[PDB]
Design an enzyme around this catalytic site. Structure first.
Site, mmCIF file in Angstrom:
data_model
loop_
_atom_site.group_PDB
_atom_site.id
_atom_site.type_symbol
_atom_site.label_atom_id
_atom_site.label_comp_id
_atom_site.label_asym_id
_atom_site.label_seq_id
_atom_site.Cartn_x
_atom_site.Cartn_y
_atom_site.Cartn_z
ATOM 1 N N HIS A 89 0.876 -1.187 0.000
ATOM 2 C CA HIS A 89 0.000 0.000 0.000
ATOM 3 C C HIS A 89 0.907 1.228 0.000
ATOM 4 O O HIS A 89 2.117 1.132 0.149
ATOM 5 C CB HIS A 89 -1.048 0.044 1.117
ATOM 6 C CG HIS A 89 -0.535 0.115 2.514
ATOM 7 N ND1 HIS A 89 -0.129 -0.990 3.207
ATOM 8 C CD2 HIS A 89 -0.547 1.122 3.431
ATOM 9 C CE1 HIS A 89 0.185 -0.668 4.454
ATOM 10 N NE2 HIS A 89 -0.078 0.609 4.633
ATOM 11 N N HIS A 110 1.714 3.758 2.032
ATOM 12 C CA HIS A 110 2.217 4.323 3.311
ATOM 13 C C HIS A 110 3.737 4.149 3.405
ATOM 14 O O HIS A 110 4.313 3.235 2.821
ATOM 15 C CB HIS A 110 1.587 3.614 4.524
ATOM 16 C CG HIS A 110 0.210 4.087 4.883
ATOM 17 N ND1 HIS A 110 -0.573 3.429 5.808
ATOM 18 C CD2 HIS A 110 -0.472 5.188 4.504
ATOM 19 C CE1 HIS A 110 -1.695 4.111 5.967
ATOM 20 N NE2 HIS A 110 -1.668 5.174 5.186
ATOM 21 N N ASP A 144 5.852 2.969 5.593
ATOM 22 C CA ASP A 144 6.456 1.706 5.991
ATOM 23 C C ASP A 144 6.604 0.723 4.830
ATOM 24 O O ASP A 144 7.499 -0.119 4.821
ATOM 25 C CB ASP A 144 5.759 1.048 7.201
ATOM 26 C CG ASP A 144 4.249 0.880 7.037
ATOM 27 O OD1 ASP A 144 3.638 1.624 6.261
ATOM 28 O OD2 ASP A 144 3.713 -0.018 7.733
ATOM 29 N N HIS A 193 -7.354 -1.432 6.107
ATOM 30 C CA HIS A 193 -6.403 -0.541 6.693
ATOM 31 C C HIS A 193 -6.206 0.728 5.867
ATOM 32 O O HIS A 193 -6.105 1.844 6.391
ATOM 33 C CB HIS A 193 -5.083 -1.304 6.865
ATOM 34 C CG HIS A 193 -3.913 -0.442 7.176
ATOM 35 N ND1 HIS A 193 -3.714 0.157 8.402
ATOM 36 C CD2 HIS A 193 -2.896 0.005 6.389
ATOM 37 C CE1 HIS A 193 -2.594 0.885 8.343
ATOM 38 N NE2 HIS A 193 -2.073 0.804 7.128
ATOM 39 N N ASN A 213 -3.560 3.368 13.310
ATOM 40 C CA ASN A 213 -3.908 4.547 12.526
ATOM 41 C C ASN A 213 -5.056 4.225 11.613
ATOM 42 O O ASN A 213 -4.872 3.425 10.662
ATOM 43 C CB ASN A 213 -2.759 5.036 11.643
ATOM 44 C CG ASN A 213 -3.181 6.209 10.762
HETATM 45 FE FE FE Z 1 -0.186 1.539 6.573
HETATM 46 O O OH Z 2 1.218 1.318 7.486
#
Ligand code: FE
Ligand code: OH
Length: 217
Positions: free
Chosen positions: A76, A78, A80, A139, A170
């Protein structure tokens, strides 16, 4: 006891089997992905929080396994997962993603992965088979899972919470009314799972999917 190898401990690799390792990095908060050791190169599932850690991860695995990292699957948009995209692109490492993940990475100012993955995509690297699956929103809007059908190993990514996670974390970008359905879609597709790797925390099994369903109540 599975083989575990560390850098000087912000980066660690833990062996699941002869060709599959989990990589875990600490951002100044740990994050997991996979290292696939294939006859044609190393393939990662996910990069790391930033370019510095991504460079170090790549350098560690190339030295150890004596082959190059050729491909990364970004699960995804993000940090990380995708934080190291600049490094991947400038090294000529192919960065696979869905089109939506690429659309979101661009929106948010990151260099773009390939946008090549569909709802179901089957890839093969040497002898290593990899399936990517978009189960729906959870998520994030774009989260995918990765399945290794020769091992029945699921990379749940951030869609799947570890046992130690006691809340959803989150949810700024989350879809809390569809996340359960998306988990169910994973459970329906993969009825016989051997390990589940969460985005953060310890490796588990299908119980992590059930745990995530409980956190969504
Ligand atoms: Fe994430
Ligand atoms: O994440």
């Amino acid at each position: 006891e599975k083989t575990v190898i560390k850098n000087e401990g912000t980066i660690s690799i833990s062996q699941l089997n002869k060709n599959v390792w989990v990589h875990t990095e600490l951002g100044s908060v740990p994050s997991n992905g996979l290292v696939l050791n294939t006859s044609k190169g190393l393939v990662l599932v996910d990069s790391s929080w930033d370019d510095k850690l991504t460079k170090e991860l790549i350098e560690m695995v190339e030295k150890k396994f004596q082959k190059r990292v050729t491909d990364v699957i970004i699960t995804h948009a993000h940090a990380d997962r995708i934080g190291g995209i600049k490094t991947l692109k400038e090294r000529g490492i192919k960065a696979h993603s869905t089109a939506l993940t690429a659309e979101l990475a661009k929106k948010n100012g990151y260099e773009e992965p390939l946008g090549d993955l569909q709802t179901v995509t089957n890839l093969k690297f040497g002898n290593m088979k990899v399936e990517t699956f978009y189960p729906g929103k959870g998520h994030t809007e774009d989260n995918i899972v990765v399945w290794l059908p020769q091992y029945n190993i699921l990379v749940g990514g951030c869609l799947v919470k570890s046992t130690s996670a006691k809340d959803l974390g989150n949810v700024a970008d989350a879809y809390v009314n569809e996340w359960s359905t998306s988990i169910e879609n994973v459970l329906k597709r993969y009825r016989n799972i051997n390990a589940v790797v969460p985005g953060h925390g310890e490796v588990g099994d299908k119980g992590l999917l059930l745990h995530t369903l409980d956190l969504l109540k």
